[PDB]
Every structure is written in structure tokens, then in C-alpha cells.
């Protein structure tokens, strides 16, 4: 999109004490947005909230919670880092932000021709070329010193991240009580469960919705494949709210009778997860009589 | 095309350009805000709820969440327009050009005339400036365009936090787990698609019978004949039956089994003398 790319184009405001506020905003806001998107799309942060919903009593201690935020923030921080790296490697965001802090006395590649009356003002205007031609050499001397530091931090940030990933994945396997092969089978189960469950939820809702539409008009218009779903997958009712509440939340490898349990849905299906009426449509049957 | 007609053109006149900027930006933000309301079906069943009660029976709490969802799902279009119009910078340099103080101007010696300060400043966006003042034309333009883009990124940041805080509060304060609401959402989409699609088929089958009663036959295509054969209609649904599935609904649970829509509430049988707008008077009055 040629028009929409020019919208997010970096336009350095060549003014002192002003070009780093823009540099912080033009880089820190997209990094913040990518951080928020990573949190929102991650399902592991909503069952953490759902854990805090029904427990309501700080039941989870620091040990399980800190190992959940580390997973949420570790997976979320991938996008801001890969944006904070590209911006540093480009060099535009750093030369604009730091052009006013270059020491005029430390300049080189020429004799001391640099003015001292308005030094911060002229320096801040280097990224926009708006410089006198007698300082053209000084402009490129600064334009390379600051771009070097921008890429020096860009490669150190890549190097530091590539070590934290190595240390994290090394400590995750060392400290986990499970073997790395079972955690690979566990990860394959959680992928297959979270895919089949969504697939059946769509079908079990369409079949349930078809029954309600049939109850209104007397017939339902269904496609060639939708008609097969009604006969192949008949529904009889809706799952109770406490049954839904028994499969949503965090889970850390509880094992039963020497046999592993790999999810809350798995733990519920074994029967190990299963008076006062809440949020009912109408009052008690005794009150209905009056 | 349209972009040529709706292209932004800054009127370089003091105390006059920002009015144009308000109209060239605030009106498309209003129109996109109106369109979001109209297209959102959740704003019409809210009206239907007020239509039948006629006594303000519902409290503020059911309405406050209902009204919030309508605005939130519709305020996206103005924001993605207000942000773009702010990151472009054209609509803000034009509006705030005349408010720039010549006293604080730099990047040039103090040659700024004082006879007409506001008049000259307001003419910067149109490049109708003397060449002796051209150093300030780029100086003023960069200062204002920076604030235009600075506000754009803060608007994105604030919006990207309100979305996060809204979704976090929606899940925490909801009485249902995030998976049941996911299933509930997958039900409403499936019901609406099925309900509208049968309503089209039901009308066509009903219309065919009316046509057959008139001409003695109906001219159907190959697929329409299947619709008549497969789906025979026996009558029409009463108005109170229709009125039992229109309005707002907030997860009423029956006998421990959830209900996911008013149609589902009606299908279970939990929703269903004085005659209004009748074609003909009372049967006794028809005789007289």
C-alpha cells in the first residue's frame, strides 16, 4: 500500500530537545502496540485471568503464577524486540534522537570551524540536511558516528536476545521434571485438543442453531455439507455452565494413578474434575406457582 | 476519482483554516461514526427493547453495557481515520499555522515582519510566502507536522491500551469462562446465518403459493422447484411470535442448562382477547 506506507514514514523533526520525544514516540508506540497484540492473541493470558476469576481468593501462589507470566511475556516480547531491532539497524531513529547531544568539541575530520553560539540548534538539524555547506563534512562525520552506535546496539540487542533464548530453553529442559520427548508429545496433544475442540464447537453450535431455526419456521435451509452435519452429529442439549467452568484455566501436569493427565478437558473426562442456583431465568418453581 | 474531489486544500486565511480542518476531518469522522451505528444490528434490538416496554423498565446496568458495545464497535472507524489524518500532518499544520508564535521561531535571524504576523503565518501551508521568510516556512512546517504525528502516535497508544483494558475487564467481570463465551459467539453467528437464510427461503416458498393462487401456476427455475418440493410451508408466524425473539438478551439460565439466544429462549418454550391492528372488526361487528 504505497499511500499507507508513507503514513508511518519517519519524518525527523530537526529541533533541539524535540527530536528524541518524536523518536521515542515513533518507536516506543509501535513497540507497545505489538506488545499488546501479543498479549491479546495469546490464550494463555485469558485462562490466567479466568483462574483469578473463579478462585477469587489468591489460591495460586507465586510459584505457578510467575511461571505463567514468564511464558506470556516471553512469547509477547518477540514482536516488540524484532521491531526495536530493525529500527536500531536502520539508524534513522537513533541519529534523529541523538543528533543534538553530539559534542561539538569532539568533532573531527576538519579544523575547529564549528560555531559555538548556537551549537545545539545546528546539530539537531543535521538529519534533515538543513545545514550550511561549510559544515557538510561535519554533518557526515556525525551521520556516521551516530549510525554506528545505532547498529552497534542493534547487533548487541540481537546477541543478548539470542543468549536469553538459549539460557531459557536450556533451563526449561533442565528444571522440568518431564523428559523433553514427553513435553513434545504433550505439546502435540494440546495442539490437537485445541483444534478439535474448536472444530466441534462450531458444529455443535450450528446443529444447535439449526434446531432452534427449525422450531420457528418448520424447516432449515442447509447446504450439501450442512445437511450431513445434522444427521451425522445430532445434539440433544447444552452443556451446563459448571461443566464449562471445569475445563477453563491454568494446568500444570497433574498425574493420576501413575498415568499422566495432559489438559483440564482430559482431567475432566476422567471424572477427576466433576443446591445453590445462580443467574436463573425465572425464580424457583415454588415461586412460579404464585 | 473521489480522492481528487475530496482532496484536502488548505485555505491560507487566518482564523479560517482550522474551521476547514475541523470540517474536513470532523465530518468524515462523524459519518464513519454514523455508519458504524447503522450497520450494527445491536443498536436496533436495543431500540426494539425500548419500543415494547414504553415505561423505561430496564435499569441502567443492562443498557450501559449494551450502549457501550455499540459505540465501541463503531468508534473504530473514526479512530482509524483520525489517526491517519493526524499522521499525514496536512490537517494539523493548516489548522495551527496562524497560532505559531514568531517570538519563539529559530533557524534564522529575526527578520520576521511584525506588520502582519498572523496573516503571513497562516499563508505558510500554501507556499505563498516571501523568499526572505522561506527559512521559517520549513521551520514552522516541521514543528507543526511533528506535533501532528506526535499526537497520532499517542492516539494509537491510548487506543491500544483502552482495547487491552476493555478486553481484560470484559473477561474478569463476566460470569462465564472465556471458552463458553467463545462457544456462545460461535452460536450467535451460526443462528443469524441460518435464520436469515431460511427467512429468504420461507418468503420465496410463501410467495410462490400466492403466485400459484393467482395465475394457476408458478415459473420456477431448476433449484426453486427443489425449494418448493423440499420445504412446504403450512402458514405464517404470528407477530407476537416474532416479537418474542427481538430485543436484547443477557444469558438467562434455565434449570442449570444455558440459553444462548432469545430464539433459543423461545424454542425451549420459555417465552410464549385483545386484538390490535386487525383487518376486520369483531366477528359480531362484521355481521353488523
Amino acid at each position, epitope marked *: 500500500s504505497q499511500e499507507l506506507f508513507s503514513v508511518v514514514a519517519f519524518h525527523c523533526p530537526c529541533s533541539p530537545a524535540r527530536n528524541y520525544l518524536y523518536g521515542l514516540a515513533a518507536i516506543g508506540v509501535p513497540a507497545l502496540v505489538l506488545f499488546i497484540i501479543g498479549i491479546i492473541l495469546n490464550n494463555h493470558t485469558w485462562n490466567l485471568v479466568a483462574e483469578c476469576q473463579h478462585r477469587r481468593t489468591k489460591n495460586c501462589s507465586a510459584a505457578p503464577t510467575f511461571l505463567l507470566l514468564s511464558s506470556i511475556l516471553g512469547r509477547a516480547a518477540v514482536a516488540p524486540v524484532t521491531w526495536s531491532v530493525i529500527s536500531l539497524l536502520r539508524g534513522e531513529a537513533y541519529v534523529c534522537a541523538l543528533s543534538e547531544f553530539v559534542d561539538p568539541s569532539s568533532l573531527t575530520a576538519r579544523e575547529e570551524h564549528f560555531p559555538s553560539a548556537h551549537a545545539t540548534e545546528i546539530l539537531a538539524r543535521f538529519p534533515c540536511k538543513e545545514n550550511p555547506d561549510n559544515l557538510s563534512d561535519f554533518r557526515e562525520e556525525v551521520s556516521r558516528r551516530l549510525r554506528y552506535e545505532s547498529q552497534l546496539f542493534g547487533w548487541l540487542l540481537i546477541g543478548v536476545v539470542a543468549i536469553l533464548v538459549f539460557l531459557t530453553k536450556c533451563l526449561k529442559h533442565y528444571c522440568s521434571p518431564l523428559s523433553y520427548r514427553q513435553e513434545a508429545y504433550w505439546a502435540q496433544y494440546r495442539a490437537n485438543e485445541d483444534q478439535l475442540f474448536q472444530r466441534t464447537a462450531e458444529v455443535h453450535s450450528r446443529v444447535l442453531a439449526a434446531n432452534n431455526v427449525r422450531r420457528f419456521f418448520g424447516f432449515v435451509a442447509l447446504n450439501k455439507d450442512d445437511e450431513e452435519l445434522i444427521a451425522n452429529f445430532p445434539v440433544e442439549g447444552t452443556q451446563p455452565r459448571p461443566q464449562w467452568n471445569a475445563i477453563t484455566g491454568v494446568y500444570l501436569y497433574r498425574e493420576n494413578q501413575g498415568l499422566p493427565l495432559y489438559s483440564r478437558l482430559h482431567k475432566w473426562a476422567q471424572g477427576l474434575a466433576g443446591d445453590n442456583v*445462580e*443467574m436463573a431465568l*425465572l425464580p424457583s418453581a*415454588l415461586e412460579v406457582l404464585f | 476519482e473521489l480522492f481528487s474531489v475530496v482532496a484536502f486544500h488548505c485555505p491560507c486565511s487566518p482564523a479560517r483554516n482550522y474551521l476547514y480542518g475541523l470540517a474536513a476531518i470532523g465530518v468524515p469522522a462523524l459519518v464513519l461514526f454514523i455508519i458504524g451505528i447503522i450497520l450494527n444490528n445491536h443498536t436496533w434490538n436495543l431500540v426494539a427493547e425500548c419500543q415494547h416496554r414504553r415505561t423505561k423498565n430496564c435499569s441502567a446496568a443492562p443498557t450501559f*453495557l449494551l450502549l457501550s458495545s455499540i459505540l465501541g464497535r463503531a468508534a473504530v472507524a473514526p479512530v482509524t481515520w483520525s489517526v491517519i489524518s493526524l499522521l499525514r500532518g496536512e490537517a494539523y499544520v493548516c489548522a495551527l499555522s496562524e497560532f505559531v508564535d514568531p517570538s519563539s521561531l529559530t533557524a534564522r535571524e529575526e527578520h520576521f515582519p511584525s506588520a502582519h504576523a498572523t496573516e503571513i503565518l497562516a499563508r505558510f501551508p500554501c507556499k505563498e510566502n516571501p523568499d526572505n521568510l522561506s527559512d521559517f516556512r520549513e521551520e514552522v512546517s516541521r514543528r507543526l507536522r511533528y506535533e501532528s504525528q506526535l499526537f497520532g502516535w499517542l492516539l494509537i497508544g491510548v487506543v491500544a491500551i483502552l482495547v487491552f483494558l476493555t478486553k481484560c475487564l470484559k473477561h474478569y467481570c463476566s460470569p462465564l469462562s472465556y471458552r463458553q463465551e467463545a462457544y456462545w459467539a460461535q452460536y450467535r453467528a451460526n443462528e443469524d446465518q441460518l435464520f436469515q437464510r431460511t427467512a429468504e427461503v420461507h418468503s420465496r416458498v410463501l410467495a410462490a403459493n400466492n403466485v400459484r393462487r393467482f395465475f394457476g401456476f408458478v415459473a420456477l427455475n431448476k433449484d426453486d422447484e427443489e425449494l418448493i418440493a423440499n420445504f412446504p410451508v403450512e402458514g405464517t408466524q404470528p407477530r407476537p411470535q416474532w416479537n418474542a425473539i427481538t430485543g436484547v438478551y443477557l444469558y438467562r439460565e434455565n434449570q442449570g442448562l444455558p440459553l444462548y439466544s432469545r430464539l433459543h429462549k423461545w424454542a425451549q418454550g420459555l417465552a410464549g382477547d385483545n386484538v390490535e391492528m386487525a383487518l376486520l372488526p369483531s366477528a359480531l361487528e362484521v355481521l353488523f
Partner: nanobody, 125 residues
Framework: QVQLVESGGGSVQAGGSLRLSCAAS????????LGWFRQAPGKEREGVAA????????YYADSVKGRFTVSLDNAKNTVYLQMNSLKPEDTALYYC???????????????????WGQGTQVTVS
């Protein structure tokens, strides 16, 4: 917390006299609902009668007014009834229930407490 004890089931012909005792044990201090329900195979459950402790008025079904009467032992905190003119329509499972006059917050909906007790009563003829 509240357990209901019921007895008095039997098999009597038409016109027989039967009495069903619903014994309530637990926290009945917040109970405002006392009555009986019947259900038979092949159909749903209906309520023959119900009593309010707090308001004091009482309900009877259409086939129960003048045919069955329900009494409350306030001192004993139990429910008693009388069965008169037994009919084949009375062959159903009888239960006694209770409730706590559930409030209503418009955001969530009605919420209350309900209890049940399993009993049987069939008339041979």
C-alpha cells in the same frame, strides 16, 4: 446444608386416605418456601401445593383444591399433607422442595437456593 426427609408412600385404591410427611433438617431459618411436587414417567413435573412461611398465603393446584390439603408443623419444622379421593392420575413420584426468595439483580438474573426430597406414591386403582 438442608436435608429433607420424606415418608408415607403406599399403594391404596380409590378413595383412600394418605398423609405425606416432609421432614426438614438443617438451616431452615432462611427458607421462605414449602410445598410439594409430583412427576410421573412420560411427562414433566407439576406442583400440587406450596406455602409461604413469611407471607403466609398458600397455593393449591386445580386438581388439589378440595382434594388434598397441606399443613405445616411450625414447632416441628416439617410439612404434612392429606390425600383424599385417590385417582389413577395420582400415580406419580412426590417430592417436597424449598427456596430462599431469590433476589434479582438485572445484570445477572435470579439467584436462590433449592432443595429436594425423593418420594413415591402410586394408587393401584
Amino acid at each position: 446444608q438442608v436435608q429433607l426427609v420424606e415418608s408415607g408412600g403406599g399403594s391404596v385404591q380409590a378413595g383412600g386416605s394418605l398423609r405425606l410427611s416432609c421432614a426438614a433438617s438443617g438451616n431452615i431459618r432462611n427458607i421462605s418456601y414449602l410445598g410439594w411436587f409430583r412427576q410421573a414417567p412420560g411427562k414433566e413435573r407439576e406442583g400440587v401445593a406450596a406455602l409461604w412461611t413469611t407471607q403466609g398465603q398458600t397455593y393449591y393446584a386445580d386438581s388439589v383444591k378440595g382434594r388434598f390439603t397441606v399443613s405445616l408443623d411450625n414447632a416441628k419444622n416439617t410439612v404434612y399433607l392429606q390425600m383424599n379421593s385417590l385417582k389413577p392420575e395420582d400415580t406419580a413420584l412426590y417430592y417436597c422442595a424449598a427456596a430462599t426468595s431469590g433476589q434479582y439483580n438485572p445484570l445477572r438474573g435470579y439467584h436462590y437456593n433449592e432443595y429436594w426430597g425423593q418420594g413415591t406414591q402410586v394408587t393401584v386403582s
